[PDB]
């Protein structure tokens, strides 16, 4: 049940223009302007404009091991006009070049940089519309509907523990969805529904939230996020909240 | 001392009380600076001190260990320029060692660790010229150093606490469908900005019946039923560390809360 939260939110058109408070990050625009790429073969990725900052944009992408993409309007190739919030297109991207300064300054909210906006083809335009139908946006947050096929033979579960200073005693599962993306879930919320092989007799359906990552995974079910157990016998009920 | 008493934690002192103590301490031979323009890194025995410096807004690196500390010092020196930092330590073998390569930036403050949090700050303010202001209740996250603090009227965080902590804790919940969502939505609509420093909370949701309720303020927003806060400067949100707020904080009148947009810690002025 995609429910009332999907009304007026499906797609990427409900993304608000959020002000950038410059005096909190007075050197931000210089980093974005100056940032460079590692010199390897660029990889294609489906990206969505989620933030705009005077001459720059941050893009979300579900591509594995990519946590957001910086778009430099002045350096990126293939741009017909300034990006707009909710724009979806394919970009060639590269990892940003790591600098010694990185340790000494604010957290950098992207891992990759767009090098070119790929021209659109009849096939890619079909993939773009498909993606729009699979996500929903509101209040500045993107969500994606996913299915975890826990009831099928392929292993789609992995435990992840993060001993970071503030999340030492928080344990999670990485879940692999049928569409290939990784999502997180608090371990205690799902542990007692799995067998010893980390499978189960149901599939897990949920709109997952995009936000700051646990490890390299930036989609999350959370403690109380609405999630649904689809049992092989046909029954559907909610996974209890944690 | 292992058997000596504990000092009042800085977290319990109202900022205005702390402002009155510190505003009269400065080194007049140094150029005055706002806290965020002062860059500091603390030796490994001064982590709590560094967190207290963050409280008044100083930019502080907290090393995880001696190796981490030395790596920072090498990197700061390699980068130089605007990124050079004052190195705070105490008289010790560490200080002696630091002088061999960082004499010009290292300050050793005697007895800094046998000394109350407020007295620690007074020592720092006597050495520097810090320009503090009464309105800066919580300029910086003491836990991760971030300046990106989202300021909410207390009722917003009370809403969050009841939905994310209390509802599932007091009786078994198979789902969240029994939470009085409309009651709390209507209370959000009638937060008097005059009671919370003029902060007007803008409430939004996709539809009158939708549970995707968002509270937006000038510094960011809070997606209540997603337990996710998002500072206006950032593209990605953070899970709010709401289970760590004592229940009693929400009985305080006209209290504002700060949610860190980078680590999710919740903070407020001391009682
Ligand atoms: Zn923080």
Numbering used by the authors:
A (entry chain B): 326 to 567
B (entry chain A): 628 to 898
Can you provide the manuscript's text about this entry?
The MUT-7 family of 3′–5′ exoribonucleases is evolutionarily conserved across the animal kingdom and plays essential roles in small RNA production in the germline. Most MUT-7 homologues carry a C-terminal domain of unknown function named MUT7-C appended to the exoribonuclease domain. Caenorhabditis elegans MUT-7 contains a specific insertion within MUT7-C, which allows binding to MUT-8 and, consequently, MUT-7 recruitment to germ granules. In addition, in C. elegans and human MUT-7, the MUT7-C domain contributes to RNA binding and is thereby crucial for ribonuclease activity.
